[PDB]
Amino acid sequence: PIETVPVKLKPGMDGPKVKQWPLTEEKIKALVEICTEMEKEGKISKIGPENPYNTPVFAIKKKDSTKWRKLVDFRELNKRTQDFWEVQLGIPHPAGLKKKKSVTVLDVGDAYFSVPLDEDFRKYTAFTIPSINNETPGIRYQYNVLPQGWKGSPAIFQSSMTKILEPFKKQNPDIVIYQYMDDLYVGSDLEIGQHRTKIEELRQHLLRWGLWMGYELHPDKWTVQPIVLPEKDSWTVNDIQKLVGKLNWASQIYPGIKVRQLSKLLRGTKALTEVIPLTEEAELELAENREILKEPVHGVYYDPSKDLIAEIQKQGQGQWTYQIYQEPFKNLKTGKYARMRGAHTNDVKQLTEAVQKITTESIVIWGKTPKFKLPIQKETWETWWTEYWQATWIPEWEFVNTPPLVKLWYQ
Amino acid sequence: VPISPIETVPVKLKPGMDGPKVKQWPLTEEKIKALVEICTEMEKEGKISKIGPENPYNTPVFAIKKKDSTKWRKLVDFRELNKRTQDFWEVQLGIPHPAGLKKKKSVTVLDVGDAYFSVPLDEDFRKYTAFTIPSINNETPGIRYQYNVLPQGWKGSPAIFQSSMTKILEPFKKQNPDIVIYQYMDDLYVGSDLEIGQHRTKIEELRQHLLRWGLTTPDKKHQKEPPFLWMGYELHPDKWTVQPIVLPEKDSWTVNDICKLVGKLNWASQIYPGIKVRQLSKLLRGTKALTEVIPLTEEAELELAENREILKEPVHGVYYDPSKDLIAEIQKQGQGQWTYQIYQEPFKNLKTGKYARMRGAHTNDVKQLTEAVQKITTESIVIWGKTPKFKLPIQKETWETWWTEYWQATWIPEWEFVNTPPLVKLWYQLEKEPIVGAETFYVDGAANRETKLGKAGYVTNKGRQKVVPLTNTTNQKTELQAIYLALQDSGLEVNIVTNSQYALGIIQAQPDKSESELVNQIIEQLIKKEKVYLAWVPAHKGIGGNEQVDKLVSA
DNA sequence: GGTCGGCGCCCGAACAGGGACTG
DNA sequence: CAGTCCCTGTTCGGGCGCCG
């Protein structure tokens, strides 16, 4: 008996038409049971081929979770409904969420099923469930309520969400709560003990309204990866060559970098393994360049109207570096991950875990998901990435093949 | 007109576009009799109805012969209607494969007679399916009908039938969950582990459940005894095989004949292991006319004779056993060619196949092997919903060296080494640190964008030097040429310093094959060496001999 | 014959993005 | 400086195979 919020696509744009990719047996059985139950609860209803729209669907398991979770790739739908959840019903982003000692994420996707969807918009939420060996044609459904993973769901439910959170926000005014997609980020400076207690207070405060998760973050312990120069006591020709190339590349970021005196040491046609003593003018150019790398870049600041972009480099031995920027060489944040799940054996798993950690950090700091430049072939990524996904959101990505130049981000 | 028992599918035209208004083709007198005989019969059965001048739409119509029968089939050239009709989402996501079938006690195959003619069309959409039937006299006005069912030749008919058919089978499948029904259009593969007595009962229960909605299951198309003919195969209680394949034996081959040959060889490669189409597909490159005669090359005739000899012996596949693991084994066959076999017990193949796509101007066997693994993995998840265990002709240390040092993310699922030559291996390893006591070469190359002329040479720490004039070249080709010279004139251990990102990116990818003959020569020189160390320095920075050799090759 | 849809292969041509060099 | 071009990869259009 709830009124529907009318939603429209962006002008001059049709709905998504993305084919469904093959799914494993364990995922198909998980989707069949969930879709059968959701159809019984009226959340979805079967449709036919007259609906020309479709969206890929697959299943996941969150970290340390046994139950399967239905996940839909609405990226294309979210790209074709962008003006709704940014202009009309936008959500503010708390700048203090990233400064908290502890931040916990909660899957509040089940609450969206309590609100019906606009009847004219149900046509675009269409998806298909494949069968093993194509035993049967595709079993199609469409959503009758607010779908999980749609960027219009948290905007419509925002007014209902604020009234649920007002009794808890008034009791605990120093706690910061942010809502992105199907997740709720609750941050506080409380001690770890009473922090988890206040979460369970909110878990029960949400259960009484008709709604459970627990992933802990510590943004105050997030570190950046700076560009560092080696501290050798004896330098060879090859060392100084690599040093100049790295300092030459870093000059695009720090305009004050100079390699004039160091290049003078490479005047002759010397053997690479030959030891070269550093001149007095070169030792000062080396020390001044180290100090410049300590300084922050001049004129770097976040633009809310610009898209976030993230690049990742495979540094070997379980090492992965990354940089987040909106304009080239104006990196908002750098970093490095080490010894993730699948280290020393599976890169796709490490690359998937790295995208998740980076995206999570972007949500906490700016409230946006970056577009990724992934160091992997397209077919290699599209084959294995779903097998290691553990998040309810999906960032956008593209594939690059930049051979290693001169190790700028890792020693 | 009576109401059909099946629920109709609402269909619209695209917004702002009207029905078709196109004139009828001139028809031969033999096809006109076949159409009028079929049109008058379908009008009596309520499948087409007469229309008057109030219907302003029209579309052509013709008829083709049915295979191995005197009956004719009525087809409508709905090319203009298909353009303005709404887009449908096809529910047929793929084609089933016998390798995914599980051993069932009893099997039954049936095909419904005239499938489309049993499913109704949307009432509001019947008006746009208007066509004229020309008479034996050109002056006779002609009989205009409109469809009441799914017209054969319409783009919406297959998508509508497959969805309408699944809706009718759901009540039976819901009551009979342990029954397996492979549904492809009108083809129903019904298998179960029930005893053969209760199996025939459930078969007749379904033949009446389908009859309630106007779907006839003729006993002519009924199949109770093995072997069953299902989707172009022969299903036996323990094994399956494709229905026989026939290749043309042309004395003079055109381009279309090779395409028909290549297509059947690709279809045969599913169970016929070792089929190669490399030398035959080389006949299709850079050719324009479909009817152009092409002579067979010596390498192409040998490949065809080998494929004919494989098709002589009988091959058969087995069925999937979910209790045992899935295994896939690959073999390097030819350069750029790979074959594989998927099985659970040795020599009992579920299916075979081949991978031969050449990706990139530069590649190696390790890249091609990884591409083949992914192609098999996707193919397996389609048919069995799982990833098989791999037996790969590559050393465990060989692969460990590759993926750990490569800058791209790359990974292969659970696999084990099989010692089947030829083995995939890296042909050279670039040193990580500069070689002590090795001559150090500073190479560079340049070219003029207009004259297409340039130089390429090197300078070493031992005073050695060389510069070579080059004609009809580019900046990229010269920088590769400079490295080729350094590799030619050096010993077994050599340090090379370049400023070419282009050249350094190609070599560090450890390629063993290339479309460029220059890269192939650089590869051949890298294999002969024992230790090679490449390095990159920025150009125009006054670095080492890289500035001395940049000035020599400047022009 | 020159109807529709699905999947697969092969090739060329179109598109498209990133470097290096030049007015 | 933007305008090229040299290179390389990707997407697509059009043929065959096969099934319904």
UniProtKB/Swiss-Prot annotation, chain A:
Changing K62E: Strong decrease in RT binding affinity for all dNTP substrates and in catalytic efficiency. 100-fold decreased sensitivity to ddNTP inhibitors. Changing A282L: 68% loss of polymerase activity. 10% loss of RNase H activity. Mg(2+) 1 binds at D107, D182, D183. Changing G214A: Complete loss of RNA-dependent DNA polymerase activity. Complete loss of RNA 5'-end and 3'-end cleavages. Changing K169R: In strain: Isolate PV22. Residues 212-218 are annotated as: RT 'primer grip'. A motif (Tryptophan repeat motif) lies at residues 381-397. Changing P52G: 64% loss of polymerase activity. 57% loss of RNase H activity. It comes from the Viruses. Changing P49G: 74% loss of polymerase activity. 86% loss of RNase H activity. Changing M181I: 54% loss of polymerase activity according to PubMed:9533880; increases polymerase activity according to PubMed:9657675. No loss of RNase H activity. Residues 41-217 form the Reverse transcriptase domain. Changing W397L: Almost complete loss of RT p66/p51 heterodimerization. Changing W384L: Almost complete loss of RT p66/p51 heterodimerization. Complete loss of polymerase activity. Changing W150F: 10% loss of DNA-directed DNA polymerase activity. 22% loss of RNA-directed DNA polymerase activity. The record marks W384, W397 as: Essential for RT p66/p51 heterodimerization. Changing L184R: 20% loss of DNA-directed DNA polymerase activity. 21% loss of RNA-directed DNA polymerase activity. Changing L71V: No loss of polymerase activity. No loss of RNase H activity. Changing D183E: Drastically reduced incorporation of phosphorothioate nucleotide. Loss of pyrophosphorolysis (reverse of the polymerase reaction). No effect on RNase H activity. This is p51 RT.
From Swiss-Prot, chain B:
Mg(2+) 2 binds at D444, E479, N499, D550. Changing L304S: 59% loss of polymerase activity. 8% loss of RNase H activity. Changing Y233A: Complete loss of RNA-dependent DNA polymerase activity. Complete loss of RNA 5'-end and 3'-end cleavages. Changing W403L: No effect on RT p66/p51 heterodimerization. Changing D186E: Strongly decreased RNA-directed and DNA-directed DNA polymerase activities. No effect on RNase H activity. Changing Y502W: Almost no effect on RNAase H activity and replication. 6-fold resistance to inhibition by BBNH. Changing V443G: Almost complete loss of virion production. Changing H236A: Complete loss of RNA-dependent DNA polymerase activity. Complete loss of RNA 5'-end and 3'-end cleavages. This is Reverse transcriptase/ribonuclease H.
